[PDB]
């Protein structure tokens, strides 16, 4: 008999790179010492490759094991590269490491939000957790508001694991997410968190004593650390109020310039570095404090062209030799996925079913008791920010 025809014998668009057909095995990923081979992992993931599920669990669990050992408020010293939201943008994360430097000779701090929104979240998690395993004392990962059951069930990350891997991997990620530190004290002068301050958090000790190994609650200190924003009029306040209910997020608070000044002074801190909010320049330096002449607050945002529609730059913060330098970078191409990770059958079949049945009904109605969408369809900064306000909110119940 003949072999089957070579699979791309009739592929229509031949120039488009074809993904790997095999999952990476354990022998290919783990060396003699049970240590991961990070460059093998990267080259496979860039090609849209996938790994044996037992390897995904092994990576995620060893990562979790290491994180769990760590203080709720880790302490990290300069030099360091600080990064904000990633949001599943694996092909941009690649670019970020090219810009900030190899994790092998570069210290990193990530402020969270590794998943949701972009359709390469699980690859981000796998790749970042491998780096954590390889460089547990030079690469650091904090928890963002998206690292929790509530938001990943609502957004696409649960689906992503179920489609690409399995429920087991999703679960292992939720326990790894519970392990993540909430905050970092950097060079004994910056407090680094994903979201911001809390009316119930006045000293660093209030952070140090938090019990983080749980789903973030809907209110409270932990919730606030992950959820709060500076007020829209930060540093140029109408009301002298310190906190107000965060209308945008639907939970937690807005904090304003006085709230930050107080917290900075009561703790002998130069400034607060954080993420959580999209920026056209990929960063924002807020009003300087009179005392120091240094920005009281910094937003750092590391996902360029957010949601493929914002056309925003990204940035990382490089802190060396007493200089804070902001490295900006743009986006990079990434492969396409249908919304919610549906395959073209699940996507089209309904249309097929509707249109053939429609045709037959129209055909069969040619006699009328003388017997006695027309096309399938896929499911700048200020403009795309208002079309997305509903999605920067805490899902109800």
């Amino acid at each position: 008999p003949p072999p089957p025809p070579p699979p791309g014998a009739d592929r229509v668009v031949k120039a488009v790179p074809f993904p790997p057909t095999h999952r990476l095995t354990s022998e290919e990923v783990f060396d003699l010492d049970g240590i991961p081979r990070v460059d093998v992992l990267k080259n496979h993931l860039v090609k849209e490759g996938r790994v044996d599920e037992e390897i995904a669990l092994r990576i995620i669990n060893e990562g979790a094991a290491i994180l769990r050992r760590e203080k709720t408020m880790i302490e990290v010293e300069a030099p360091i590269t600080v990064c904000g939201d990633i949001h599943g943008q694996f092909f941009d994360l690649m670019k970020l490491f090219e810009v900030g430097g190899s994790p092998a000779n570069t210290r990193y701090l990530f402020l969270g939000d590794y998943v949701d929104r972009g359709y390469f979240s699980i690859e981000c998690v796998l790749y970042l957790w491998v780096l954590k395993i390889l460089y547990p004392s030079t690469l650091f990962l904090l928890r963002g508001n998206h690292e929790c059951r509530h938001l990943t069930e609502y957004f696409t990350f649960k689906q992503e694991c179920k489609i690409k891997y399995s429920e087991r991997v999703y679960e292992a990620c939720m326990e790894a997410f519970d392990s993540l530190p909430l905050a970092a004290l950097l060079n004994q002068q910056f407090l680094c968190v994903h979201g911001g301050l809390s009316p119930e958090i006045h000293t660093l000790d209030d952070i140090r004593r938090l019990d983080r190994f749980k789903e973030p609650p809907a209110f409270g200190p932990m919730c606030d650390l992950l959820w709060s924003d500076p007020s829209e009029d930060f540093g140029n306040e109408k009301s002298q109020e310190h906190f107000s209910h965060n209308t945008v997020r639907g939970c937690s608070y807005f904090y304003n310039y006085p709230a930050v000044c107080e917290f900075l002074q009561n703790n002998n801190l130069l400034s607060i570095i954080r993420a959580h909010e999209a920026q056209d320049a990929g960063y924002r330096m807020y009003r300087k404090s009179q005392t120091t002449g240094f920005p009281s607050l910094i937003t750092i945002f590391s996902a360029p062209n957010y949601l493929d529609v914002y056309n925003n730059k990204a940035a990382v913060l490089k802190y060396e030799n007493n200089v804070m330098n902001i490295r900006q970078f743009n986006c990079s191409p990434h492969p396409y996925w249908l919304p919610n990770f549906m395959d073209v059958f699940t996507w089209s079949l309904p249309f097929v079913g509707e249109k053939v049945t429609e045709m037959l009904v129209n055909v069969l109605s040619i006699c009328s008791d003388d017997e006695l969408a027309r096309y399938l369809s896929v499911l700048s900064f200020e403009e795309a920010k208002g079309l997305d306000r509903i999605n920067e909110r805490m899902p109800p119940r």
């Binding site: 089957p4 025809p5 070579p6 699979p7 791309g8 014998a9 009739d10 592929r11 229509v12 668009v13 488009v16 074809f18 993904p19 057909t21 849209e48 492969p335 396409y336 996925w337 249908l338 395959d343 073209v344 059958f345 699940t346 089209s348 079949l349 309904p350 249309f351 097929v352 079913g353 509707e354 249109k355 053939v356 049945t357 429609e358 045709m359 037959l360 009904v361 129209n362 055909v363 069969l364 040619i366 006699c367 003388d370 017997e371 027309r374 096309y375 399938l376 369809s377 896929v378």
Partner: protein
């Protein structure tokens, strides 16, 4: 007096008689077969992107027209008495252009392009087509058997929608 037509359907004597009436009215030139033009002359069909696929599936002997047996046997796929596997095999046949029993990358693209038009870029379409096959291709021949097809879509219960009264 002619020899009997032989066929396999879910239909009874009455229903076959009623289907036979629609056949003759649709058979304009009254040749005993149904041409593409005769199908396309019904206004409701003209903007349906799937008409030709349906006809190609009905046309089982391959001569480009639909005779009464193939008409009966085609409509019967949509009978209220049809099992799930039958409705799925028909949907499978929509994608399987050359009827070899497999769905190839090339075919999937072509049938989707036919329905999607210019909504997606070709590059995008090619990629989700790649990813769909790779995921469902249990035995690595690069195409999609019927058994593999069902494994993906069997739980969608679309077969409940593919039903007509006769």
């Amino acid at each position: 007096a002619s020899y009997p037509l032989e066929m396999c359907s879910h239909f009874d004597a009455d229903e076959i008689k009623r289907l036979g009436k629609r056949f003759k009215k649709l058979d304009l030139d009254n040749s005993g077969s149904l041409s593409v033009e005769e199908f396309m002359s019904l206004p409701e069909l003209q903007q349906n992107p799937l008409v030709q696929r349906v006809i190609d599936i009905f046309d089982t002997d391959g001569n480009g027209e639909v005779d009464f047996k193939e008409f009966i046997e085609g409509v019967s796929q949509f009978s209220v008495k049809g099992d799930k596997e039958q409705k799925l095999r028909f949907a499978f046949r929509i994608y399987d252009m050359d009827k070899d029993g497999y769905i190839s990358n090339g075919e999937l693209f072509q049938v989707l392009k036919m329905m999607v038009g210019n909504n997606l870029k070709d590059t995008q379409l090619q990629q989700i087509v790649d990813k769909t096959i790779i995921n469902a291709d249990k035995d690595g021949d690069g195409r999609i058997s019927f058994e593999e097809f069902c494994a993906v879509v069997g739980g969608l219960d679309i077969h409940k929608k593919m039903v007509v009264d006769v």
